[PDB]
Write an enzyme that holds these catalytic residues in place. Structure first.
Site, mmCIF file in Angstrom:
data_model
loop_
_atom_site.group_PDB
_atom_site.id
_atom_site.type_symbol
_atom_site.label_atom_id
_atom_site.label_comp_id
_atom_site.label_asym_id
_atom_site.label_seq_id
_atom_site.Cartn_x
_atom_site.Cartn_y
_atom_site.Cartn_z
ATOM 1 N N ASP A 172 -40.820 39.581 -3.603
ATOM 2 C CA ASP A 172 -39.227 39.805 -3.781
ATOM 3 C C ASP A 172 -39.238 41.354 -3.843
ATOM 4 O OD1 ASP A 172 -36.535 38.886 -3.995
ATOM 5 O OD2 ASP A 172 -36.930 38.909 -6.177
ATOM 6 N N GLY A 189 -30.044 43.814 -17.144
ATOM 7 C CA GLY A 189 -29.744 43.059 -16.019
ATOM 8 C C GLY A 189 -30.120 41.630 -15.731
ATOM 9 N N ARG A 190 -29.996 41.027 -14.791
ATOM 10 C CA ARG A 190 -30.509 39.737 -14.508
ATOM 11 C C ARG A 190 -31.802 39.890 -13.493
ATOM 12 N NH1 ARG A 190 -25.512 35.949 -14.433
ATOM 13 N NH2 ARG A 190 -25.464 36.095 -12.066
ATOM 14 N N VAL A 247 -32.690 40.563 -19.039
ATOM 15 C CA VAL A 247 -33.552 41.369 -19.598
ATOM 16 C C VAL A 247 -32.760 42.458 -20.778
ATOM 17 C CG1 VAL A 247 -35.094 43.550 -18.916
ATOM 18 C CG2 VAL A 247 -34.410 41.634 -17.348
HETATM 19 C C1 LIG Z 1 -32.577 51.964 -19.613
HETATM 20 O O1 LIG Z 1 -33.313 50.931 -18.708
HETATM 21 C C2 LIG Z 1 -32.560 50.166 -17.930
HETATM 22 C C3 LIG Z 1 -31.280 50.408 -17.728
HETATM 23 C C4 LIG Z 1 -30.731 49.521 -16.712
HETATM 24 C C5 LIG Z 1 -29.454 49.805 -16.502
HETATM 25 O O2 LIG Z 1 -28.818 50.704 -16.627
HETATM 26 N N1 LIG Z 1 -28.564 48.628 -16.181
HETATM 27 C C6 LIG Z 1 -27.166 48.597 -16.037
HETATM 28 C C7 LIG Z 1 -26.641 48.786 -14.643
HETATM 29 C C8 LIG Z 1 -25.499 48.436 -14.452
HETATM 30 O O3 LIG Z 1 -24.956 47.367 -14.851
HETATM 31 C C9 LIG Z 1 -25.119 46.865 -16.291
HETATM 32 C C10 LIG Z 1 -26.646 47.371 -16.820
HETATM 33 C C11 LIG Z 1 -31.431 48.554 -15.844
HETATM 34 C C12 LIG Z 1 -32.750 48.502 -16.233
HETATM 35 C C13 LIG Z 1 -33.726 49.575 -17.051
HETATM 36 N N2 LIG Z 1 -34.953 49.530 -17.522
HETATM 37 C C14 LIG Z 1 -35.915 48.435 -17.177
HETATM 38 N N3 LIG Z 1 -36.929 48.786 -17.856
HETATM 39 C C15 LIG Z 1 -38.040 48.065 -17.611
HETATM 40 C C16 LIG Z 1 -38.033 46.828 -16.871
HETATM 41 C C17 LIG Z 1 -36.668 46.515 -16.289
HETATM 42 C C18 LIG Z 1 -36.417 45.459 -15.635
HETATM 43 C C19 LIG Z 1 -37.423 44.290 -15.369
HETATM 44 N N4 LIG Z 1 -37.065 43.272 -14.789
HETATM 45 C C20 LIG Z 1 -36.090 43.107 -13.867
HETATM 46 C C21 LIG Z 1 -35.019 44.274 -14.124
HETATM 47 C C22 LIG Z 1 -35.156 45.285 -14.927
HETATM 48 C C23 LIG Z 1 -33.572 43.873 -13.009
HETATM 49 C C24 LIG Z 1 -32.544 43.378 -14.035
HETATM 50 C C25 LIG Z 1 -33.428 45.175 -12.304
HETATM 51 O O4 LIG Z 1 -32.465 45.080 -11.284
HETATM 52 C C26 LIG Z 1 -34.259 42.927 -12.209
HETATM 53 N N5 LIG Z 1 -35.534 42.371 -13.070
HETATM 54 N N6 LIG Z 1 -35.723 47.239 -16.513
#
Ligand SMILES: COc1cc(C(=O)NC2CCOCC2)ccc1Nc1nccc(-c2cnc3c(c2)[C@@](C)(CO)CN3)n1
EC number: 2.7.11.25
Length: 336
Positions: A184, A76-77, A83
């Protein structure tokens, strides 16, 4: 003289090391992105600190495409960077990487979580700089964000809402006792384990290391009244925002948005706390917990620890966590 020589020794190199080494180096990055852009050398500066044996530098280098690579599409963003899933080519270990431009990089991104030992805070694996790019490496949490679960589920049952808010307030209690403001707190910045049982805080883009006047507010719908009125801010801003996140999980919509237009700052300052958005169908202890978190006067607003106690007690009152992991869609509240 202590930090001055530590950073002098770390500069121009990627090393295995401890949080304090990364933290010290991160301050010099925050300052560099404030300076005017210079002409780039032939070979980009490569420097930073990996905090786990899972990510291994090679002859004091850790460069994208060479030593590690992103694979598949973005997770995501974040507030200041996208990320991705990445893999260390030597060790085969996977993690998450946030890619931040140096001129938007705040050292608080790493100071807020570097070497913290809480299960409610996403572990930091390290951070490496390639010229004007800071790569922040963190444990991969397979379940995705609470924000994505709420969009998919429409809204959450009270027990699931309480359970995650509980785990978030444990996270916030750990931070606040170490003089760290998250800044946040919203469903988008809570990540879940693959079975949905563990929640952890991420994205410290808006963090301050403490009362203060330097707080960059995140999401206008989750901002405490004291922020809008340009007053002094403490840890209590996170307590308010955590109860806005609670209203979001229960209702399927941010507070304020379904009642007011334009910039909400005025409405947040002027209106009663959004206690009216509390579902009538909620248990008394639930409504009482959210009411004490949404007190407009920070001095009277409960602490993360205090709200955590109430929320744990509210979860018992409704029977504990019975609701199933990824159940059936629940229709979000309609506008009036
Ligand atoms: C399989 O893992 C993950 C899958 C997904 C996922 O399914 N995304 C889809 C959702 C639908 O649209 C398409 C993409 C998201 C995070 C995951 N894991 C993850 N693990 C560690 C750190 C971080 C992270 C760190 N800082 C972040 C965020 C995430 C934000 C973007 C989360 O909002 C904000 N700042 N995230």
């Amino acid at each position: 003289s202590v930090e001055e020589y530590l950073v002098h020794a770390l500069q121009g190199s990627v090393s295995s090391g401890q949080a304090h080494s990364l933290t010290s180096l991160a301050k010099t990055w925050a300052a560099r992105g404030s300076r005017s852009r210079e002409p780039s050398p032939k070979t980009e500066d490569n420097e930073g600190v990996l905090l786990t044996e899972k990510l291994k530098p090679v002859d004091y280098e850790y460069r994208e495409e060479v030593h590690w690579a992103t694979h598949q599409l973005r997770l995501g963003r974040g507030s200041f960077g996208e990320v991705h899933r990445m893999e260390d080519k030597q060790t085969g270990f996977q993690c998450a990487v946030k890619k931040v431009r140096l001129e938007v990089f705040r050292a608080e991104e790493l100071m807020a979580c570097a070497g913290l030992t809480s299960p409610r805070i996403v572990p930091l694996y390290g951070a490496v700089r390639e010229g004007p790019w800071v790569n922040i490496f963190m444990e991969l949490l397979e379940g995705g964000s609470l924000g994505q679960l709420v969009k998919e589920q429409g809204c959450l049952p009270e027990d699931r809402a309480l359970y995650y808010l509980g785990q978030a307030l444990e996270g916030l209690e750990y931070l606040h006792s170490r003089r760290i403001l998250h800044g946040d707190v919203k469903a988008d910045n809570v990540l879940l384990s693959s079975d949905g049982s563990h929640a952890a805080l991420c994205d410290f883009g808006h963090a301050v290391c403490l009362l203060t006047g330097d707080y960059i507010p995140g999401t206008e719908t989750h901002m405490a009244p004291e922020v809008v009125l340009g007053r002094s801010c403490d840890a209590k801003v996170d307590v308010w925002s955590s109860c806005c996140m609670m209203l979001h999980m229960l209702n399927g919509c941010h507070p304020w948005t379904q009642f007011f237009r334009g910039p909400l700052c005025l409405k947040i300052a002027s209106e009663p706390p959004p206690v009216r958005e509390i579902p009538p169908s909620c248990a008394p202890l639930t409504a009482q917990a959210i009411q004490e978190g949404l007190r407009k006067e920070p001095i009277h607003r409960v602490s993360a620890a205090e709200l955590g106690g109430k929320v744990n007690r509210a979860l018992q009152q409704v029977g504990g966590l019975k609701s199933p992991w990824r159940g059936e869609y629940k229709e979000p509240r309609h506008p009036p």
